Amino acid sequence: EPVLRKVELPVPTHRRPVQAWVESLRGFEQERVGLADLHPDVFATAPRLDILHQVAMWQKNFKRISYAKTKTRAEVRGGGRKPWPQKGTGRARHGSIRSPLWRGGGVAHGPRGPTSYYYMLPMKVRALGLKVALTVKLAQDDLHIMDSLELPTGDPQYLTELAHYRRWGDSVLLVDLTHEEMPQSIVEATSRLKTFNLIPAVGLNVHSMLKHQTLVLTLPTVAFLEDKLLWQDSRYRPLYPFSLPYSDFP
């Protein structure tokens, strides 16, 4: 009984849904249990590696808060009195022993206070980055769709052997719809592994997709991503934050 998935969201009349093999983790050789149609505007978009770079750098930096601070000549202890008179000493003119020139003095232009590098790319840009990441994985044959993440056993050895047999990458990012419903078998299998990382659908991000060689998705996660990312296309300009009630937005 093939697991055949069709695209629920409307597809552009000039584009045909891309296709992928729906697999299953229940067995080593279960490499083809169905056929899934993925939306072309999500899984066959332009390969904009520039946007990939933009989103990856945003993810790396916007959370960054450097805690490096140096004491300026005003904050270094002491250094109030003039070391010696202006004239007659035959020495260089100075006004305090804590100026940037002196040993143990202040830092003229150093890191000042905890600095934030926070900046937000447009949500459309970030959604497009997610789409481009998915398209890159699919085009480079690193995307593997699954019917479900249910494993026959919780042994990490089984998962590693399955990945090696299927010729997956050294690192696999497995994705499930929601955190709560993630199968206990896969939870146990991935809790002990380091290069196999299990995340909910809401946790998908460009940086992790790039860090992990292969991306494993389930059919409900595929539908979730399609809906969420396609909404950004054809959404209005916001009247107010989308957290607030809207006529048709969940």
């Binding site: 390969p47 520039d50 085009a139 790039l210 860090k211 107010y240 009630p245």
Partner: protein, 287 residues
């Protein structure tokens, strides 16, 4: 796509292959080296190199240009001047054609904002929307539109196409609420009563020729006939139209929304409308 095929042929995209789009990242210029060192582009002595040149607008001691010009009330009271966003009939027709504004229901500021036909900023002294004669010649939609200001030609076009136009005042608070009702409903305050126009605007909204919401309804037919005669079209008897009730629906002068009355509380969480029953509260909210 050929790009996707090239991806298939190329190595894996990872965090070690990313490059910014050329031209997006300008090189940073810092004062080290022969070309950018030494005086570091600051000049030679004077105030410029010392970083102590006089403030902007200073002219070396000569009476500055921006001070030797006499003061004139160009911007006197700018923060108190009322502003009305223009809504051309071209824009209205575009919205109606694209379905962003539904002409089968009474069109008002809330519906325009929801359709994104106009962006109101009550904090920036915007007092509403003014109809504009632009696009009048090619305007064909029949609609019941309520605005704040309206031009004679815009009114003529709306009425010629069988529609109805009324000018309704909105004080800043009611304007903010009507433009963004959902945030107000989340504030949890009871719906306030729309305030009357300021004395200066009272004669405008009490005039039939402007289709004021506070004008005598008995004077509307004469004004409509005058516009029809002036602009050379036959006044359509909307009372015989199938949408006559919708065209006639006009909210009460003290009412912000169509159905909701002042004083009600909209509990959106459980889809309810709490209506006060205290006699004093009812009297105040009906005042």
């Amino acid at each position: 796509a050929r790009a996707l095929d090239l991806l298939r042929g190329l190595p894996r995209v990872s965090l070690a292959n990313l490059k910014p789009n050329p031209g997006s990242k300008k090189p940073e210029r810092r004062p080290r080296g022969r070309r950018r060192g030494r005086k570091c582009g600051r000049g030679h002595k004077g105030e410029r190199q010392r970083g102590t040149r006089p403030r902007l607008g200073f002219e070396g001691g000569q009476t500055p240009f921006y001070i030797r010009i006499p003061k004139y009330g160009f911007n006197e009271g700018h923060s108190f001047r009322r502003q009305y966003k223009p809504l051309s009939l071209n824009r209205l027709q575009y919205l109606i054609d694209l379905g962003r504004v539904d002409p089968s229901q009474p069109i008002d500021l809330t519906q325009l904002v929801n359709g994104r036909g106009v962006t109101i900023q009550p904090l920036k002294r915007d007092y509403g929307v003014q109809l504009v004669e632009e696009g009048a010649d090619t305007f064909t939609a029949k609609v019941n539109i309520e605005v704040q200001l309206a031009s004679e030609l815009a009114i003529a076009a709306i009425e010629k196409n069988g529609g109805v136009v009324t000018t309704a005042f909105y004080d800043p608070r009611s304007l903010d609420i009507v433009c963004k009702p959902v945030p107000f409903f989340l504030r949890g305050q009871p719906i306030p009563k729309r305030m009357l126009p300021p004395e200066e605007l009272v004669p405008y909204y009490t005039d039939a020729k402007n289709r004021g919401y506070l004008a005598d309804p008995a004077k509307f037919p004469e004004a409509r006939l005058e516009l029809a005669r002036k602009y050379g079209y036959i006044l359509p008897d909307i009372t015989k139209d199938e949408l006559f009730k919708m065209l006639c629906t006009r909210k009460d002068p003290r009412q912000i929304f169509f159905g909701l009355a002042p004083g009600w509380v909209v509990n959106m969480a459980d889809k309810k409308i709490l209506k006060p029953t205290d006699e004093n509260l009812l009297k105040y909210y009906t005042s």
